[PDB]
From a paper:
[name] (and its homologues) contain 4 RNA recognition motif domains (RRMs) separated by long flexible linkers and arrayed, when not bound to RNA, in a relatively extended, linear conformation.
Although [name] and [name] are likely to have similar structures because of their high sequence identity (75%), to begin to tease out the structural basis for observed differences in splicing regulation we have determined the structure of a C-terminal fragment of [name] that contains RRMs 3 and 4 (nPTB34). nPTB34, a C-terminal [name] fragment that contains RRMs 3 and 4 (residues 336-531) was over-expressed in E. coli, purified and crystallized by sitting drop vapor diffusion in 20% PEG 6000, 0.1 Tris pH 8.0 with 2 mM ZnCl2 as an additive. The crystals diffracted X-rays to 1.7 Å and were found to belong to space-group P1. Instead, phases were obtained by multi-wavelength anomalous dispersion (MAD) using data collected from a crystal of Se-Met-labeled nPTB34. This produced a high-quality electron density map that revealed a total of eight nPTB34 molecules in the asymmetric unit. The eight polypeptide chains were built almost in their entirety; due to poor electron density residue 336 at the start of nPTB34 was omitted, as were residues 420-423 (and one or two flanking residues in some chains) at the C-terminal end of the β4-β5 loop of RRM3. The structures of the eight copies of nPTB34 within the asymmetric unit of our crystals are very similar to one another. There are a total of 12 Zn2+ ions associated with each asymmetric unit which mediate crystal contacts between nPTB34 molecules involving variously His 412, His 491 and His 520. In each case the required tetrahedral coordination appears to be completed by Cl− ions and/or water molecules.
Numbering used by the authors: 337 to 419, 424 to 531
């Protein structure tokens, strides 16, 4: 039970990489396949069954590129790679897998989709106005913002959960300069 079926996707907007990013919040996505004969649906293979049931539980019914997605357990056992239009993607041993490290289930901010995002790996002389503008530019409005004591991390509250999902998809691993890539997670905290 490692393969999720995700339907009612936005056929025109969704990519494998956006599905990687979003489902990678809850597990390590091994492979994605958008279906050729039903491009609003896709198969997603997690590393294991706990990851699959977690992703299903938290993402089913959430709004992604404007549409309410449905996430169920697939009838498939694995997601087969092809011998094209890039509907398939292999993400084996991705450097972007959050749950590489032993015990990581507790240190990746595993929470339901939340209007407040948790930012980490921020480099110095990234200002607040800089992060507000970057997040606002994903099409949302930034309601609140708070640095933690070192400015390596921050909370940032978009107007809605929908807008936070969009931002997370867009800006996780964003290059903020120096050699710092931003990490965006959900949060149960509030500013
Ligand atoms: Cl299918
Ligand atoms: Zn099938
Ligand atoms: Zn640093």
């Amino acid at each position: 039970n490692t393969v999720l079926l995700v339907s009612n996707l936005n056929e025109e907007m969704v990519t494998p990489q956006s599905l990687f990013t979003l489902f990678g919040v809850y597990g390590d996505v091994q492979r994605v396949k958008i279906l050729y004969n039903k491009k609003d649906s896709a198969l997603i293979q997690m590393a294991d069954g706990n990851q699959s049931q977690l992703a299903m539980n938290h993402l089913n019914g959430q709004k992604m590129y404007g549409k309410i997605i449905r996430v169920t357990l697939s009838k498939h056992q694995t997601v087969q790679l092809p011998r094209d239009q890039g509907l398939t993607k292999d993400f084996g041993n991705s450097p972007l897998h959050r749950f590489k490290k032993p015990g990581s289930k507790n240190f990746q901010n595993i929470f339901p989709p939340s209007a407040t995002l948790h930012l980490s790996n921020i480099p110095p002389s990234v200002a607040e106005e800089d992060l507000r503008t970057l997040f606002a530019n994903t099409g949302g409005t930034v309601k609140a913002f708070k640095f933690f004591q070192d400015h390596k991390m921050a909370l940032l509250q978009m107007a809605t959960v929908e807008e936070a999902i969009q931002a997370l998809i867009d800006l996780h691993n964003y290059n903020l300069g120096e050699n710092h890539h931003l990490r965006v997670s959900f949060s149960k905290s509030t500013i």
